[PDB]
Amino acid sequence: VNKYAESWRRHQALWKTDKNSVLDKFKARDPSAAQFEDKLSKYAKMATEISAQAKDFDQDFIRVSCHALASSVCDEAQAWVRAIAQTMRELDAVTE
Amino acid sequence: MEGVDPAVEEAAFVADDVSNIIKESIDAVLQNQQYSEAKVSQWTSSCLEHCIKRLTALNKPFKYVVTCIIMQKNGAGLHTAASCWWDSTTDGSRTVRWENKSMYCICTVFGLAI
Amino acid sequence: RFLRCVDVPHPRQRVPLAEFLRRMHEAATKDVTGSPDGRDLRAAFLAVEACRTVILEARQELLAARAGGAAVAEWAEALESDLRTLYGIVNARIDRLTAAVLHHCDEYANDKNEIQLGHVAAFKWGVWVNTAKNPRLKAVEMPQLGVTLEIPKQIALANIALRVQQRSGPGVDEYFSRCANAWMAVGGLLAVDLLAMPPGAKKVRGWTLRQVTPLALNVQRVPYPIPPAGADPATWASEEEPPPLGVTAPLPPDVVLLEDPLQVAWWDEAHSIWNTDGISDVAFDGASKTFSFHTTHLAPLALVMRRTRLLPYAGWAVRPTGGRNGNGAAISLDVGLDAPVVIEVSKGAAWLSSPAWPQLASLIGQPMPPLDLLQALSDRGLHLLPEDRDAEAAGVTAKARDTEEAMCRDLALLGGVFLMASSR
Amino acid sequence: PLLTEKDLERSVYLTLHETETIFIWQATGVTVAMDTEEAKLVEEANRRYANLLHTKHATDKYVDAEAQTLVASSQSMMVRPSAYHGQSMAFGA
Amino acid sequence: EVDIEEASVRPRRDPIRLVVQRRRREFNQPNAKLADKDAHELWNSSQMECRPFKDPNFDMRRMEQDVAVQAVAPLRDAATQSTGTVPPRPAVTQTEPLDLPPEAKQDLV
Amino acid sequence: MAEAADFALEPPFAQKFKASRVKEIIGSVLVARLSGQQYHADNTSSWAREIADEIKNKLKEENWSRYKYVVQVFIAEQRGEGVRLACRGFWDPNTDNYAHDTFSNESLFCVATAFGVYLY
Amino acid sequence: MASGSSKAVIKNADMSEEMQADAVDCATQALEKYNIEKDIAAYIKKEFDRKHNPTWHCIVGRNFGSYVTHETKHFIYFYLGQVAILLFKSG
Amino acid sequence: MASGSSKAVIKNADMSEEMQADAVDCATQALEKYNIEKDIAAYIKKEFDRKHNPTWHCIVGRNFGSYVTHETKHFIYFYLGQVAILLFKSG
Amino acid sequence: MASGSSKAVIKNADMSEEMQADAVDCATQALEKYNIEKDIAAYIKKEFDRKHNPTWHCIVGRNFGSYVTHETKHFIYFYLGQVAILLFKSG
Amino acid sequence: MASGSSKAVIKNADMSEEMQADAVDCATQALEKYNIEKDIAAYIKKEFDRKHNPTWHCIVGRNFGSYVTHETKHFIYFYLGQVAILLFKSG
Amino acid sequence: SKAVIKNADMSEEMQADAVDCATQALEKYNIEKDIAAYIKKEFDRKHNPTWHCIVGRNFGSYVTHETKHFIYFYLGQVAILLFKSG
């Protein structure tokens, strides 16, 4: 059970990495729309993978519900997605 | 002059016939043509096609390789040399150069028995 | 059909049937010049049998056809389109097989220089190639089709090939929806085709050089006569009718002379009729059922009877046989023939009772639907399924289909209860 | 598997294909035979091209313009029935 | 116009395809002895030359030239089909005992 | 001597004519022979012969069995002559292959071509 | 003839609604006129190149797996009965 | 490519107007006369070599960002239908 | 591990021989490392976007028909044993 | 800031081998300088206008066919990454 | 017990293979279930699964089989049925 629980920590970066710092570093390089789309698609695909992996795991005589954990990590990835579109729309508004 | 076996000659490289084929193919496309950079590629293609069609019409158990180079006449010197590794009992090769007041056309044909 | 597990889609599978059809066509037209795959007779005979089955089903569905009116009309048009596609596929497959065979003549040659190949399925096929150019050979006999041919000096002096193809049985004739005025094929179709020599292979030191040819992809057809060693049969021809090829072939043993006088014809493709002209010495040996004729035009050949030979039928007289109520009948027909043809019919199925000819014995006493009974009779060859272009040819008022069918149903409501008679 | 006698006797089909015209080298040759009116024409073309160079150099005739040529997600799809079950059974025993 | 209907290279005929067939046992000839033939050996057959002539020496300062630009060659539409067996055929199967003829039984009798 | 039963008509993929390897061989020969070399009509024919011999020797050292090698070397002075060089063949494309390379300096330009035709 | 248009079930679509409807209809005609998957894909691809500017790419079949890059709002993948149809605009 | 006419979206035209109309016309005839990008480029180049004092350079393609010099009143870039074309006199 | 290299049956290829061999090797690695067709396609596409740059498209399957537009010398459709692999550059 | 993982294939060049090496180096430097192919071509053009007998028009792009009257001893055509470059002089 | 081929959409060689495999299964086993299991697994190993095998003396079946992938025969008085599907 502990090994299964620790296996979910391979995605710990989503909730342990500073979104503000990562976004500032990404934006300081004058990122292209291609890189924006790449990051958005990467976060979306990891979110979809977590949602698909939101399943009950039966270890011997104990079942394990990752529904709350997987939902939380998917929400984290969706927030990662949202705070890219927010910057992009603000830039578009300034230009317009 | 002893009589060559017709069966051997059917699968033997005939340098004279290959040279005649090359000369006629060159003359059919370039005998009365002055050098033209636009049409030189089509001329080379036509010469290669004529050489290939005549070699195939010869109907011998030989894979045929035809190369054609057309260079403009301006005083530039061109020198060629070929070294090959093959069974020299049946196969063969032939190089023919033709010229007008405008171009040099060098065609080399290799026939290699299957 | 489902129990039989038939290898082809029924005509009631329009899109799947058409896809199967042209994928048959792609298989038949596939390039097999460099492999012996196309040199197998069964590789073509399989498609031939498949197409025969589809032709049988399509003819069964079309004879009944021959909002609802428009639907049945387009269904018919689809049926004849399928039939034409099947004929084309069969022809292309046979041409591919023969082309693949002749593309290796250097290996298929025999000691005699006269190559004789045959195969009988329904359909008999035979090819004879005379590369010997023997001038004294005037008679060629092929037992694989049972045919004897008195040939002219042209074949004796020239090197050609000759293909004889006899299609017999159900669904083998097309010149009833293809013919124009009064002709049809009887006893099957005999396609005789002259063939020029395709470019053969060259053998050098055991190596065999083989070049791709359109003749190697498919074969062509050459009409009569044969060039006298250096002419052009396709364009040039003897202005006088060339020495007529006497073709004595075994007619299927279920056909008796009904055309008076007996006639054999070559299909006048340019005229859409059966050209009896140039087809001389028309004889029929009934002791062995063999039709002999001297032909000056090599093309689809057949014994031919007039589509108006029995038209109009002199009268009909149908009695009840189903007892008190309507459950059976027996019709005696004076169709312009000697014996009054008596058919015992009953609910769903009809069977001949007289004449009791052994040629028709397979249907005498055979309880099976009257439509397919007349279909099987026409398979031997009988004008029992007439057309309007045959009625007006015979010179009688072709009853309009609506009136005819309404009258049919009105009398059939009365069938086993009343007595019916023909009105002159 | 070792080839048998019938395999050895079998005639192996080999196919030869004619290749296309394979152009190898096209030197950007710069000459025409000045002994010929062809090179007279090409030389007057060369001098008119030099005149074009001079005219371009003459005045403010080098102005250019911008060309902002502005003219991509990778999705994974799967197509499977994924329903197989090998099952054995005895009947009526 | 005529510039390209001259410059363009179009094949004048289809490629010629030949099939050579021989018995499998006829292959693997041990007499096949590939040998070296240098250009000095092929001097009379392959090693040619075009000597630069000095008296005419008609080389000119050609200044205008055009080059056939392709970049990415025109994209080709490709139709690919992956199919297995031709559509399956049904079957009728029923168990039925098989027995020898009474004629054969009486023969054994 | 190998019998016809085990005689493989097609060369092993390790023994197949490697177009990239022949490109590398031809380029190495051209660099070793013509880099920094000025055109010399008396020396050009000998240089072409040496280049062809070296390329053929390297192809032999590659030791691809039953692969006949044909090497052709063109070396010409760069006086600006319009040159159109092309080739066209008729063989079995499944086993036979080709390669070529070009070198050019301020004085001369050369094209060295090697064809490997499989023997059966 | 009966309208044998099976219920189109859309799995993955980065499209507009009218584009999805057009794709469903085009796939319906493609299946009605052709059962060969490459012919179906060719019909759909040429129809949508004419309608919505080249180049589209169509893959039709029953057993396959793909990983392709598509233009935004230019991607669809669905079933029409038992047949899998994929369309994507790229290049 | 081949067509009867196409919309030349001119991003910039260092031209006179009549000779812009000439450019539209010549590119139009090139479209139906030829079927290759290089072909259309050469057709336009020869058209203005005959009309407007050679030599002109013409580029036809799909996706290419370039920067060139030319002579004033003799430059244009336009996405003619499905092909972008850069046409400019520069000697 | 036995080197059960299923001989690739090149059905239709427009590339060079060396790059076709590289494609065969990449497909062999893909089938060695994965067991899902989408995984095979993703591996091949990523490998060839690292080698020959995006964009590539790979379809792995056994029952499919495709009609796609590919860049010249950037196409292959073959069979690695019973596995059909299609690769083409577009985008 | 950008670069291509494809060996520079110089299809043809009317300029010396070391000149072409300098051209490849300049193209690479342009790639690391800019992300827009227009600016890639612009920087290559300005570099070889200040270095290599101006004016060297540069065209960088994937697919395009053209004729240009390049000044002699002043032309190269080479594929790099996924963009072909026509780097010639006509000024 | 000679194999009595009742129905065959097959080739000759792999008909002989089917006969040999069925003979081996009958030699090694005594239950029709096990014989069918052996036949099916061997033919999956040899001839591109998926196959299906039914062994017994009392059964009537109607199945759809791939072309050249169907046989129904008798070994002695035991009926063995093979057909490839899925």
UniProtKB/Swiss-Prot annotation, chain K:
Protein name: Dynein 8 kDa light chain, flagellar outer arm
Main localization of the protein described in the UniProt heading: cytoplasm
GO biological process: one example: microtubule-based process
Subunit structure as annotated in this protein's UniProt entry: Consists of at least 3 heavy chains (alpha, beta and gamma), 2 intermediate chains and 8 light chains.
GO cellular component: axoneme; ciliary plasm; dynein complex; microtubule; motile cilium
Location in the cell: Cytoplasm, Cytoskeleton, Flagellum axoneme
Lineage, opening ranks: Eukaryota, Viridiplantae, Chlorophyta, core chlorophytes, Chlorophyceae
InterPro entries associated with the record: DLC_sf (IPR037177), Dynein_light_1/2_CS (IPR019763), Dynein_light_chain_typ-1/2 (IPR001372)
Top-level taxon: Eukaryota
Cystine crosslinks: none
